[PDB]
């Protein structure tokens, strides 16, 4: 008896609110969603997961003094090319990155790890293209 393995199945689309939701807590879920690990036909080597849309990405809450104290770094190949960026500035400049970045780091690494990240459309505030479905959830 060989273990069952799904065929091309269904490209699902799911909508999430973000506003008021912590961040990592939300990221956790969005990740598990990204790689259909809720689906009972989960498969590690294929990418049979939901496409996730997220709105109100800028009203992500966050505890402690993270707005000032938490910093995102970026190293250019150059000398002294290590840039330091605090939450505040990010949100005020490029929200939807703060959450995109929290999910990128929670998806596995690899060519398949990527792609799963591609199946994630984060947007500032509300609104977005509504071509597919979007069974909103919590």
């Amino acid at each position: 008896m060989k273990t069952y393995v799904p065929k091309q199945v269904e490209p699902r689309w799911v909508l999430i609110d973000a506003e008021g939701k912590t961040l990592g807590r939300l990221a956790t879920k969005i990740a598990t969603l990204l790689r259909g690990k809720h689906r009972p036909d989960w498969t590690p080597n294929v990418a049979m997961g939901d496409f996730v849309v997220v709105v109100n990405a800028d009203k992500i809450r966050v505890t402690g003094k993270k707005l000032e104290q938490k910093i995102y770094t970026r190293y250019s190949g150059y000398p002294g090319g290590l840039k330091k960026i605090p939450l505040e500035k990010m949100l005020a400049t490029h929200p939807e990155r703060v959450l995109e970045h929290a999910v990128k780091g929670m998806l596995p690494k690899g060519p398949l790890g990527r792609r799963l990240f591609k199946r994630l459309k984060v947007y500032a505030g509300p609104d977005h293209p509504h071509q597919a479905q979007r069974p909103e959830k919590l």
Binding site: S76, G77, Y78, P79, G81
Partner: protein, 205 residues
């Protein structure tokens, strides 16, 4: 933010107030605005500004009589002006009064493969004493085992020149509208007959 295209003509001195004034005569010919593109269908504001007329129809089908005054498409419509909305039609040298500073963007003369020392003003080696085939060489380019590599921007020999260069805050010594001439004093990049674009200064903006 008035801008205009033109060709570096030459250099010469002027004499004013019993003082020699070294200037660079640029011809800023009439520039037929051929497109505008606003935050409507573009997201910013500028002015396609076709220059030299020419073109005995070496113009092929990509021509734009769309915007009426194409007056036989020009050789180099290239380059807008960004945040400039002209006197409606045709921009000329009239946008500049003697006494205004301007920023000239040009294409610096090319020098091809230029060595460190010229490219970068390195001191090179000694021409005598120890010497030995390293007179115009860059010397050391690193350390030892750590980092064990060369920095990302290490100044080395390579192509140098023939690039975008903008000499800033140049005085407008004079303007001669009769012939579309404009006199700035000094250091406009590129060779004569090369194309330049003259803009408002950024000291005030």
């Amino acid at each position: 933010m008035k801008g205009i295209l033109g060709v570096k003509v030459g250099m010469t001195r002027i004499f004013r107030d019993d003082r020699a004034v070294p200037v660079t005569v640029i011809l800023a010919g009439p520039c037929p605005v051929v497109q505008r593109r606003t935050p409507e269908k573009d997201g910013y504001t500028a002015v396609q500004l076709g220059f030299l007329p020419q073109n005995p129809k070496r113009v092929n089908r990509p021509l734009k009589g769309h915007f009426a005054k194409a007056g036989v498409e020009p050789v180099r419509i290239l380059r807008e002006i960004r945040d400039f909305n002209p006197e409606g039609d045709t921009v000329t040298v009239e946008i500049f009064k003697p006494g205004e500073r301007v920023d000239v963007t040009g294409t610096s003369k090319g020098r091809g493969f230029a060595g460190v020392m010229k490219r970068w003003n390195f001191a090179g080696g000694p021409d005598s004493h120890g010497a030995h085939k390293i007179h115009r060489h860059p010397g050391s380019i690193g350390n030892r085992k750590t980092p064990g590599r060369v920095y990302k921007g290490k100044k080395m020999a390579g192509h140098y020149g023939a690039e975008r260069v903008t000499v800033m805050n140049l005085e407008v010594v004079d303007v001669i509208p009769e012939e579309n001439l404009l006199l700035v004093k000094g250091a406009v990049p590129g060779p004569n007959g090369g194309l330049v674009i003259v803009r408002e200064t950024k000291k005030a903006a």
